[PDB]
Amino acid sequence: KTCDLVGEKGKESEKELALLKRLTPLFQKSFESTVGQSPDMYSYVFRVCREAGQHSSGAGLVQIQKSNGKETVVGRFNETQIFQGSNWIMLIYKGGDEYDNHCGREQRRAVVMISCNRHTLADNFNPVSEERGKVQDCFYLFEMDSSLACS
């Protein structure tokens, strides 16, 4: 099980496929981070096209509430979209858990900005913000370094 792109097999973007192929070396890797104070003590676990959760729900990125260890799925890698610019790669996992009292109760979303760092294959995975104040198109933002994002 790897990331799934938009469209039945074959109608898929050769650009996005070429990118998935490029990110292969990060598949085996796992990224973690704990942000927040208390009602914010969160631990975000991120993976590229691999289960980042312990509930086998196909999570590409999970948000763990340190207090009670409850696991929330922020995005799923079978609803993945990717594209790159000159020195960055944007990764997006959709199909996350539904909001209950925010954003029209739409599924959660994770947006990961991958910037170019010649010094490491991958490192510095850091949560930036959560936009849950819109009627739609909300999301969680994270950033990380990777030499794969370089040209």
Next chain:
Amino acid sequence: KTCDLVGEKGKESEKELALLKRLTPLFQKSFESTDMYSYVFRVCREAGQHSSGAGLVQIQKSNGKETVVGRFNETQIFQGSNWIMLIYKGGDEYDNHCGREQRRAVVMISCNRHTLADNFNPVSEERGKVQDCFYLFEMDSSLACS
């Protein structure tokens, strides 16, 4: 009259309104790509010459045809550490691509101390998907620094 964010007036995300304020000094400017097409980009202002309400337009050099890539009444904007991403939705619909959906503009604005705004260039056009296609552009700006 400027950029329109998802939601009712005065009820839009405070994170986006804040961002629109920081980009005000770019409102009165106009950016152009340096092929076959010419792209003209503007922040929350008409970039075309046909009152279509275009935020970014693609011009057919040979015949002067103006194609609306995205309109500013349908903006989405957010920022990271040293970059801001602006997206204009609702361009002219595709005829033989992307489930004939409306075109779209994605502009990546990276930080740069030396300029208020410069180096606007097309990066690519993703028209090979059943949906969620888009045109991608990059530009430098000191307003993208923090």
